[PDB]
Paper text:
Toxin-antitoxin (TA) systems are found in most bacterial genomes and generally comprise small bicistronic loci encoding a protein toxin and a protein or RNA antitoxin. Here, we present microbiological, biochemical, structural and biophysical characterisation of the ParDE1 and ParDE2 TA systems from M. tuberculosis.
The ParDE2 crystal structure exists as a heterodimer containing a half-unresolved ParD2 antitoxin. β1/α1 and α2 form a hairpin structure which links to the anti-parallel β sheet core of β2–β4. A RelE/ParE superfamily alignment allowed us to plot and visualise the conserved hydrophobic residues within the ParE2 toxin structure, which are clearly concentrated on the internally facing residues of the α helical hairpin and throughout the β sheet core of the toxin. This positioning creates two major hydrophobic grooves on the surface of the ParE2 toxin which run along the β sheet core and through to the underside of the toxin between the hairpin helices. Notable contacts are the ionic bonds formed between ParD2 E45 (on α1) and ParE2 K57 (found on the loop region between α2 and β2) and between ParD2 R47 (on α1) and ParE2 (D14) (on α1, also). In contrast, when the C-terminal helix of ParE2 is removed from the search model, unmodelled electron density is present in its place, and can be more successfully built as residues I36–N49 of ParD2. This demonstrated that ParD2 α1 displaced the predicted ParE2 α4, which likely became disordered as is seen for other ParDE system complexes. Finally, given the time taken to crystallise, and that there is no remaining space in the crystal due to packing, it was considered likely that ParDE2 underwent limited proteolysis during crystallisation. The full ParDE2 complex structure is yet to be fully elucidated as the N-terminal dimerisation domain of ParD2 was cleaved during crystallisation.
Numbering used by the authors:
A (entry chain A): 2 to 88
B (entry chain B): 36 to 71
Write the structure that this text describes.
């Protein structure tokens, strides 16, 4: 089993996105976050090299329908969640 | 994609300071504390 680790600046990247939803669409905040936790804990660990490359060795997976993706890196031992940016 | 974000994602990849790498459940509980 590969071990799963999250940079803290992701927390930054997240609320930078929640902003566009709080007040007006507070329901999306839990939606998009629960998508994110899914991708990070189930979708990516399932098959981390299958998802499209972002640049160089980095990969990503859009948290559809939202146009935010999870950028990540996959060594043979680890999976490092690096960012959540828009696209 | 945007050179900004490539720098941001490579920076964090290159961050070797072990204190910035929250495990998942650590990370999760932390976000729940916020707006929760
Ligand atoms: Cl598989
Ligand atoms: Cl797939």
């Amino acid at each position: 089993t590969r071990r799963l680790r999250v940079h803290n600046g992701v927390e930054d990247d997240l609320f930078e996105a929640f902003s566009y939803y709080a007040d007006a669409a507070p329901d999306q905040i839990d939606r998009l976050y629960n998508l994110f936790v899914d991708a990070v804990t189930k979708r990516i660990p399932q098959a981390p090299n299958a998802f499209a490359p972002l640049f160089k060795h980095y990969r990503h997976i859009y948290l559809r329908p939202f146009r935010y993706y999870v950028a990540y890196r996959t060594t043979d031992e680890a999976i490092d969640i690096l960012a959540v940016r828009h696209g | 994609i945007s050179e900004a974000n490539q720098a941001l994602i490579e920076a964090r990849a290159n961050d070797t300071d072990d204190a910035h790498w929250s495990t998942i459940d650590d990370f999760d509980k932390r976000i729940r504390a916020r707006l929760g």
